[PDB]
Design a protein around this ligand. Sequence first.
Ligand SMILES: Nc1ncnc2c1ncn2[C@@H]1O[C@H](COP(=O)(O)OP(=O)(O)O)[C@@H](O)[C@H]1O
Ligand SMILES: [Mg+2]
Length: 813
Amino acid sequence: FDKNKRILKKYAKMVSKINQIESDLRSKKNSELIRLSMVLKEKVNSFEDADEHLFEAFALVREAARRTLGMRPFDVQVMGGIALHEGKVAEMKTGEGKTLAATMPIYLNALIGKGVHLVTVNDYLARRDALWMGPVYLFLGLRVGVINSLGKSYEVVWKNPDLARKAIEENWSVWPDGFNGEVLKEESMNKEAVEAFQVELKEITRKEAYLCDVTYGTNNEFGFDYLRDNLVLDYNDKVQRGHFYAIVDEADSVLIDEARTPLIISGPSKESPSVYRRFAQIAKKFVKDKDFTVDEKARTIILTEEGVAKAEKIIGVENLYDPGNVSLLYHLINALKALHLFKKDVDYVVMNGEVIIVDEFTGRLLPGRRYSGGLHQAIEAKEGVPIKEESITYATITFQNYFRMYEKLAGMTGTAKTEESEFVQVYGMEVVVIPTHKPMIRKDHDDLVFRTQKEKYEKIVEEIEKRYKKGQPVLVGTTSIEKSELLSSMLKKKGIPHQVLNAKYHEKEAEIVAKAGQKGMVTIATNMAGRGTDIKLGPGVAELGGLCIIGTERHESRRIDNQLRGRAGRQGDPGESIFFLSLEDDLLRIFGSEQIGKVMNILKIEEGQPIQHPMLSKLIENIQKKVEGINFSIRKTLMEMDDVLDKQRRAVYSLRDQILLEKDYDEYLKDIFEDVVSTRVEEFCSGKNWDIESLKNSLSFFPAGLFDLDEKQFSSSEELHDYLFNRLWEEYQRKKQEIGEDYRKVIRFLMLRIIDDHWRRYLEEVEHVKEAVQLRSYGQKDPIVEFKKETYYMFDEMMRRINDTIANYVLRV
Ligand SMILES: Nc1ncnc2c1ncn2[C@@H]1O[C@H](COP(=O)(O)OP(=O)(O)O)[C@@H](O)[C@H]1O
Ligand SMILES: [Mg+2]
């Protein structure tokens, strides 16, 4: 059946019922309305409870909006609101009222007391939307938070707290009593009340911005907060309170487009080359097999008791294995290993002062990149010259995997339907195409395809001239600054005044509004500049045919084109739209230039002119649609792999969180201590095996001696396990005794260190394998199976190394 019809049919009924309420509430006094919000706040405490009072809630919001901003939400805006509350992507054409529309569901689900996240694309839109919708929220007793870069969090407050109360106390409104239109007039609204409900920004802390009933921010910042939140050493330095309900504004932009590059926290090379080189020779003095042992089984180097001492005396620090000197320790291992374990031409080469190697000879030209963990820098230090800046990665996550954390996800755009597949396969969200408020009368012309770019751009500038002379305003869309700068040359060599836009949003939206709509105004916008800022038509301009959209080229995704296009018709406004193409454009270059090119020659054309026909326009659509196909498939494979990683990341973070919150590590240590002994017992001394020389060889990292193994009188493997563990756990207790109660903290710190360390090194390593599988999977274990299985082995090793590193640190300190 038709989902969009059934769903919509239901919404209609609902919106209808919300209308009957209005007559009950429009009569109420400002204090009565606030009292109702209070009753609702205590009545609505879960999702079940939210749908119960959704009628009352949505209606109340409407009124507060009619009295607070002068805007009375349209039926459609109430429709979209519901589609948000239901965890779907409400497709509402641009200039429809999404901002306001979102206010109703936001308010409703915000009464649960777990917070509500509104994500946009940038700072402006985050800050702007807040201040713009703030009064309504404040009026109903909600605290509105806002999160921007760099270290910026604010709280929308009344501009004149005293003045707002007069307006509530007394029954002030912006919308005069008795007006019964769908739209108030800027000319006729009680300025006494507009000025009363003015809102401004108040600098607050990050943590607090989230403790607000709702939180407005950028997709970037919400995610960054989460990653940072997993770099803490105190569960109290977190600035988030879980992930409850998030409405993603500009869904297609955040959840698909901005979402293809994974969110990263990159830093700079911590240590200096001076120290590497200083360790490059500190490492030439450690006598192999005395101060340490290498068992590249392969492949690690592990010190002995003579080596910990040399270094300690040498460095010289009281304790090598202590919380402060781990950097030192760590540095020593890289330098000690580099030349004692990578040799020379096995398989790296120093040619031209650059080290490069292997890869089993496909060939050694992996330049390709440097080794993980700062080992590479250690090699150059060894070879003589010279060390290069490295960039460490502390945390990563993709947007898909992030917004997936939220209990209820929701989004809204004017461009969602064409990509329903994606919202459903990635975020599990349906698209509900909300009808427009007023009829949509914008004339979308068939595309103009030219032979050559020169001809494309030359005939584009004729259009600008031709429409400018007429008085009709023009918004020209480009895809690079390069292309925007070029147009600007052309335009001014024929003396045509105009505005160019790219990326400083607070300012650009400022003119985008006055500029596109106002008579005889030309504006060039790069990459959807002035996004989200509504363009109102100027006086006399509607008769001219309204704003005229020019696409300098079609994008690889019809979405992006419909984003520029939707900018013109508006609320049944008149507007025009045309896309220029050339057989040399990338999209065309990618597909059908020649198939088109020939039809061009065959027909009476081409004169230096363009070919235009519905069937061609339609052809471009299919071709452009097919180019999206191949992308999404490609992209989805990457996604699957990203997910495979994400699952590990969760386990780690979830653990990190527990370590953060555990005051007693008695049980956790037992789990580590046992896994330390169990694995070494089950492989060396079990089934057909009873090799001990090798057992204590593997456990040699610990301080000799818990090494009282040579008095061997083991009857069975269970005795050995239980025993090995004993001397381990006894030591732990013997050590709980002296450090006293400051020990829980010391451990905690060490655990986080080790786990972060290994996590960051793991990720670096994993990347190589990601690419390894990607390129070499052909032809072809579904790349995921290779990756899932290979990534597994690696993670399993990481857990082993973490345990040994943890078990070993708590005992030596
Ligand atoms: N309910 C309403 N009543 C009157 N005007 C509205 C209403 N909703 C939106 N507008 C007008 O539309 C413009 C805002 O559109 P916007 O909410 O930014 O669209 P979208 O959210 O689809 O991008 C504003 O200039 C505002 O004057
Ligand atoms: Mg918007």
